[PDB]
């Protein structure tokens, strides 16, 4: 319950919902004119925030210190307004908690939320046939178009969802140094 009232106001106050040329997302601003996508989500030279064309004046796909794949873009808009700054709810590691909530925001799955449960730092992961570090893992069906999806507890803002199959989902930890 209180995971739930806690996403339904981040949702409302820093998501959105966004189209590349491979997909929707639900997107997450972090601070100033900063968001984060799925690596997957590819943002070209614009995307379309809540129907309206956007700029994005750049774009960072974060690997680790070994190269190794994070499925994070980190996307600069060019916006005059500036997303509330989050970074206080976003860890320095790795968070596990006993009760999450997925929050997705987009035209297939409108401000939906599911239980998702324990979360566990699953840590390696070839995901999509790309070794891949820092996943979150928590038991729940989840589905194509929820990537982009906001893992959150109360007061804490985990990861976003990247990935999954059968009855298994995986987050990629959306750590504060990310943001400096
Ligand atoms: C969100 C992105 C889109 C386009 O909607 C999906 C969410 C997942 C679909 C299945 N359930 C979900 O929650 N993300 C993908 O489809 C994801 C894409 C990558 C990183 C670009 N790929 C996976 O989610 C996932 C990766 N592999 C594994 O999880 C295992 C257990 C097999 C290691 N699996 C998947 O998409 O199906 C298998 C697969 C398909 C294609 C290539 C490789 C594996």
């Given at each position: 319950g209180?995971?739930?009232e806690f996403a339904v106001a981040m949702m409302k106050r820093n998501?959105?919902?966004?189209?590349?040329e491979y997909g929707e997302?639900?997107?997450?601003?972090?601070?100033?004119?900063?968001?984060?996508?799925?690596?997957?989500?590819?943002?070209?030279?614009?995307?379309?925030?809540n129907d309206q064309e956007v700029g994005?004046?750049?774009?960072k796909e974060?690997?680790?210190?070994?190269?190794?794949?994070?499925?994070?873009?980190?996307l600069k808009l060019n916006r005059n307004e500036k997303f509330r700054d989050?970074?206080?709810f976003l860890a320095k590691e790795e968070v596990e908690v006993n009760?999450?909530?997925?929050?997705?925001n987009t035209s297939k799955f409108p401000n939906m939320y599911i239980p998702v449960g324990q979360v566990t730092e699953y840590g390696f992961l070839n995901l999509g046939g790309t070794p891949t570090k820092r996943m979150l893992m928590y038991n729940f069906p989840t589905r194509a178009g929820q990537?982009?999806?906001?893992?959150?507890?109360?007061?804490?803002?985990?990861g976003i969802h990247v990935g999954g199959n059968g009855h298994q989902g995986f987050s990629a930890a959306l750590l504060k140094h990310y943001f400096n």
């Amino acid at each position: 319950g209180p995971a739930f009232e806690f996403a339904v106001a981040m949702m409302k106050r820093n998501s959105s919902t966004v189209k590349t040329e491979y997909g929707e997302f639900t997107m997450l601003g972090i601070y100033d004119r900063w968001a984060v996508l799925p690596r997957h989500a590819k943002p070209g030279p614009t995307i379309l925030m809540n129907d309206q064309e956007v700029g994005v004046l750049d774009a960072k796909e974060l690997v680790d210190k070994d190269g190794t794949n994070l499925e994070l873009t980190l996307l600069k808009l060019n916006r005059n307004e500036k997303f509330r700054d989050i970074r206080g709810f976003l860890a320095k590691e790795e968070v596990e908690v006993n009760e999450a909530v997925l929050a997705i925001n987009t035209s297939k799955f409108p401000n939906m939320y599911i239980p998702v449960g324990q979360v566990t730092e699953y840590g390696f992961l070839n995901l999509g046939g790309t070794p891949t570090k820092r996943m979150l893992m928590y038991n729940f069906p989840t589905r194509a178009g929820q990537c982009g999806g906001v893992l959150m507890s109360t007061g804490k803002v985990l990861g976003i969802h990247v990935g999954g199959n059968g009855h298994q989902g995986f987050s990629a930890a959306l750590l504060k140094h990310y943001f400096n």
